[PDB]
Symmetry: D3
């Protein structure tokens, strides 16, 4: 289930990572949207531990099986709102940041759906799950 | 130089991100290695703001022009130690986490050069710069 | 939900595609494995119509939410049998056939888990869903 | 020339695959265009058996060496008609379905050159060769 | 057929490029192998002008339709000698130099088939066609 | 520092490659721009020998550390002129020629900044460094 118990090795790193979650917990950004961002990022990054945790946490936040099964192919479905689709486009592009430039009008399109405080919180969410995925995959973590 | 002043929009997000840096500042992991990790990740992710900042910070940590110019092609040079090369392999693979699975023996190879506490700190470093790059590129940040 | 009613346009094409399903229905290859192959291929190919249909059909074949949510990251989980993992490796490699050569020992590894008749049936399953996905995405099909 | 005699292992699979060809034989879609679709798909998928067979079959359908040698780079040549170029764009995009979304206006552009029955037949052709390529490469088939 | 007459614009550039060909003409490396290297590189780089020219020049050097049609999928055919396959592996890897590191043992494997003078000549051939392709595609050149 | 002394093995190849440099030396195209083209191409192709040489040669041509460290991420910086950015776009696209088609309007955009003789010289520069990189990486060359 893990190859390295990293939170025990560096309690400071674990505390710092929990600080990201504390900030997000205080954010106005709605929790079901954060869970989608987390689940989709974890899918893209191939972090099975995080996929399992956030599919489970998304259900805790009220999500349906229809949405959870469609998330990996969200672009070609009618299940996600204009606001969610904006956030998921952001999520996908930032997950794949090593692969090339972000399109010019992307932030501008996000601004049609989110105020700037929400954008900061959304980007924190994206950054945090990207960070958790790196610990998850790196330390060789497996679900159940 | 920026399209969105995100630290002003969400002070909580900014404080949380600074908490990653506070943890790293307290880590035993040597600062010049952290700067290489930061600079290389920022290059891969195309974050010009972070490239500029960390090339400058690497010089503050004593780095030579030879190493700074060779970092983007580090694999085929003799300038980086076995320990640094292990960390840079980790850095590159985790930067590109969306692109496929991590090789099986990668953590095992890292363990030949780093103790588990160092590995946790190194992974925190990788995670933190990946997070900063996402704010940098997302918010449309440009250097000087 | 569709941009082109292709089965009405070419009844012969539709009948031919149903012939693939008739053959598979008669195959010894177990149905839950076929559903995994179908669902995973549809995810890779981004066919939302087929993802929806086969996640639903997989439940009809007895599948758990744990397996359905973990399928997209199956490699790093303990939920799939040696035989299923062999089939899913085959599935992923053949889904991505345009991207490069198949590894040398792949068929040999499949032979450790499947007899040659099963391999033929498995490859028919892979081929059939790849075909359905092409109609699904091409004709602009969306679920629910 | 083959690692697994799949048609002998599963006669039902072979009969089902021949049913795709029977439908195409009855289609109004012109045979030389089908051969181009088959040859180009087989090139993209790296199926040497199918490349050999369809380059040979294309000659049987009247094709010139000029067209056969230019097909792999068809975009930057004057040898292919507006209708063929539409079909080849479709062919390339659907060959590479695992690599990302199909452009929005692609079906609309195809409709400028083909009626809906032809589009269904063309998509059957694309699907069928994609299926044959998977058997060809999977079963380790080599030409001559 | 061309968007820019580059040889007229810079006669010095044209003379320099012809100097590569003069050196190759004097090389011991056999001409049919050079033509394969040229044709395969031109295919990979999508230079239709060069594909046309070198498929035609390969016929002038004695090549068969069987080999010319199989070249794009050479790996899975029996038509190319151990020596040619070594050269084509070199050709493919160096065509795709922007895509990642060259495998460690590649030069060593080439040395099993070629002496060092031949390797230098082969690499000149690869370099020269890569250069011609860049003029061809850049200047918008089309065959016939 | 090298696995094969290629200039000694084939003096003709070396003389031919020097002929590219002789032509460029005579070109009106300004030397600092050529050095940027060389350095950026060498970075993309992962040729550590050439990166080292041209970062050093760029300093000889007057370049600043600010520009040299920002070159790998030039798109998102203000340090490069409209003319340089046009040349670097050309450089990147032609470095990555094996990866797909060149955008339609690219030569047209280059023509807004360069006359046709300059474009020929620029393309010679791109071609020459692509050639040198292939010798550098192929022959296993390492800096210092």
């Amino acid at each position: 289930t893990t190859r390295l118990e990293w939170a025990k090795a560096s309690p400071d790193a674990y505390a710092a990572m929990l600080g990201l979650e504390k900030a997000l917990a205080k954010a106005g950004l709605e929790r079901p949207l954060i869970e989608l961002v987390y689940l989709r990022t974890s899918q893209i990054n191939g972090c099975a531990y995080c996929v399992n945790m956030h599919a489970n946490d998304a259900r805790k936040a009220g999500e349906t099986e229809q949405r959870l099964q469609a998330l990996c192919v969200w672009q070609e479905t009618p299940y996600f709102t204009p606001r969610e689709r904006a956030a998921l486009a952001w999520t996908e592009q930032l997950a794949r940041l090593s692969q090339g430039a972000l399109p010019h009008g992307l932030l501008d399109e996000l601004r049609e759906h989110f105020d700037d405080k929400e954008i900061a919180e959304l980007t924190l969410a994206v950054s945090a799950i990207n960070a958790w995925n790196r610990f998850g995959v790196g330390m060789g973590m497996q679900p159940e």
